[PDB]
Amino acid sequence: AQDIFLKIDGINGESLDDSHKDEIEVLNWNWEIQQKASVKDLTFEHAIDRASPNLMKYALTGKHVDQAVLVMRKAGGNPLEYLKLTMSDVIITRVRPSGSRDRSRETVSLSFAKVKQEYVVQNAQGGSGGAVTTSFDIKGNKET
Amino acid sequence: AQDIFLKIDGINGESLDDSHKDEIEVLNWNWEIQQKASVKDLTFEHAIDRASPNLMKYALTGKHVDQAVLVMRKAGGNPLEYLKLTMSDVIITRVRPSGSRDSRETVSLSFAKVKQEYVVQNAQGGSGGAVTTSFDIKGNKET
Amino acid sequence: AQDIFLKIDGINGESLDDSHKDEIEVLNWNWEIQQKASVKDLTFEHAIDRASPNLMKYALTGKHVDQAVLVMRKAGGNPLEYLKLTMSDVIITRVRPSGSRDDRSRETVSLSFAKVKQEYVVQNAQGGSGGAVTTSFDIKGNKET
Amino acid sequence: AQDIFLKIDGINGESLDDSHKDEIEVLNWNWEIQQKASVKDLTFEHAIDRASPNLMKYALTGKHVDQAVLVMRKAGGNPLEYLKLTMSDVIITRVRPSGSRDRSRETVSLSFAKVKQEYVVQNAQGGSGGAVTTSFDIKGNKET
Amino acid sequence: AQDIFLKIDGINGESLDDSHKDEIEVLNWNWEIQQKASVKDLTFEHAIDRASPNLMKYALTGKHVDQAVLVMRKAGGNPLEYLKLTMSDVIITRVRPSGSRDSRETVSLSFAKVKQEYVVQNAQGGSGGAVTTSFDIKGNKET
């Protein structure tokens, strides 16, 4: 059971994690690019939490935020942050809260002008094996 | 197992909860906002109950009600009311009753304005603070 | 396990229940109203039974019947009839029978109606009738009643 | 586990049942009428059997057959034929055979000019409790 | 557990069955005719095997083959070949290979003419007779 965090400028979550205080604890996420290219929103799920009233507001106003950063960190003896997705000039495009007597979930989508992806390689001994980083100005349709 | 309540002006439920007497006991609910913005109906499910004949009536007439308030309350030793969604100038847009031998009703609401309050819980289980936003959907303005 | 009954004027079922003799025993049902308003057919499922050949006939002719009454009754020690849906000026709009060798033969049926009344019966502490909440509407005439 | 039979004029099945010799043994079936009225095909499933090559032929040619009769008969100590659906002037509109290493099924549809439905009521003692029969000339849009 | 074989002219499989050497072993299949008549492709599934590279080629070229023959054979003590479907002037219309770590390929065929033979089994498990029909789909005539 790995940890997934999302840090959205101006929209705090309620994580108690030492390295990700006040970020949003993410249950799951997905994203898509299709063939210039068609870049879909990134979508994530979290519990209804401290971020939710602000996520609602930004969805309605459409106001941009500077940056959102998504991180996946492996669980266990060697807890590496192995994937980091950095989104610049972000819009909250969709919010879908729900609740049940038997559970509170809220599904959120984000669009962004630029993106950067960093992946860290872990070796069998658990240390850093290398790293790959790429980035792209989607709005400007240019490599960065 | 948390409790969810909905208080609709002019349409009583039959809850026996001390702090929510005659409100509607909600089984589940969902809502959506999409990118001015497209705000979807809020939908909830409840058992067929004392509210149902009036929900049917309002669905048919289209008459507005002043306010509906949805509350989620945590279960357990510290039963905190941590989410409050206040809907102003409400229409009953849809009612979908059903029953089986082996009985539930799905209802949708639309509203001119909305307020969402999340109540932050402190380490002792009490109120530590809140985050609150509101919006005039009809007028397309922050409030 | 609650009981659900449907009484359709001129189309008997084969229920043996004392208070609902010759009515249709309903397995399940559903209905919908959408925003003047759009009122959908009411749909129910029952076993292929004595009603089925007449339901077929009425589906084909389109002939109206005066009234259909749907009732749900709680199971157990206090069998309260807690929901009564009365549909006036009714058409059989859909019939969908089926069967399988591996038991079960069922039929899905839909109804349309000019007027509707919904009564919910409130239960008292002794399990008896404590009162009711009732509403009604002339759908065809688009008026509250 | 009840028995279901279909007797199609000119298209024999391979049933060994005393009362339904050479009829088609039916696995399941369904039918539909919608609001003059829109009468859908009746559809049934059977194993690929002696009828299948003829069902294929009639589906391709579109030649009519005089009559098809579907019967459901209860299983057990009191085996009543409680539902009989009689279809007149029948067309084979669809045939969908399939097979598997893990099974042979074939789905068939029928359309018809006229229909008759007979239902027999069974009492708790297992005997005949009464009967209801209706019929309709669909092509002519008239009660019969 | 019955056996299903497909013999396609010019496209060998790798079956080791004595009576169907070098034919394709079929996992499942289906076909459809709808109401002159609309005859759909016949579709079958097999493991990725020796046929696959040629199935890919014919799918791409659209070149016809003379004949494909599908046979179902009963399992057990009396392994009767009870269904034979003969397809004449065949096109490979579709190939859908796939594989997973935890490998199958779906193929579709179209044809100008068809013959279906069902072999009737006698009480001793032998051939008791047959029912046979055929049709020129392309020419829209019985044969």
Add this chain to the structure above:
Amino acid sequence: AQDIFLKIDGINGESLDDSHKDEIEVLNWNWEIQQKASVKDLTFEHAIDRASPNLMKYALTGKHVDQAVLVMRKAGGNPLEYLKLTMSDVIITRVRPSGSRDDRSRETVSLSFAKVKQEYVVQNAQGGSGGAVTTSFDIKGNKET
């Protein structure tokens, strides 16, 4: 449990397999040709890995790569590489990453290509290479090769 590998020129994976070092370990894949002919993208799934940031980049730029080779190898005592699909002049048309707290992070990727070759390796009785059946096609040029 068989192994599936994909070698994409200029986009390394992180496989540790001796005969497929730094290739992409594939969880599953599928492809389609329909009736000149309509050749669909090949789609595969892999874990989010060293390839992923480059796959994203190439999806966005649309830049071609020379070749991608997909291989399936039987598991067990005789690990035969029995299927080899060689795709020439390749575009990354689709990337779909996802992750969940409850383990697993996976990514679905699609490829398009101008030419294709499919080799199936026939296995001999000893489990070794007995031969092959091989075909190839210039999809862009619409010609058999």
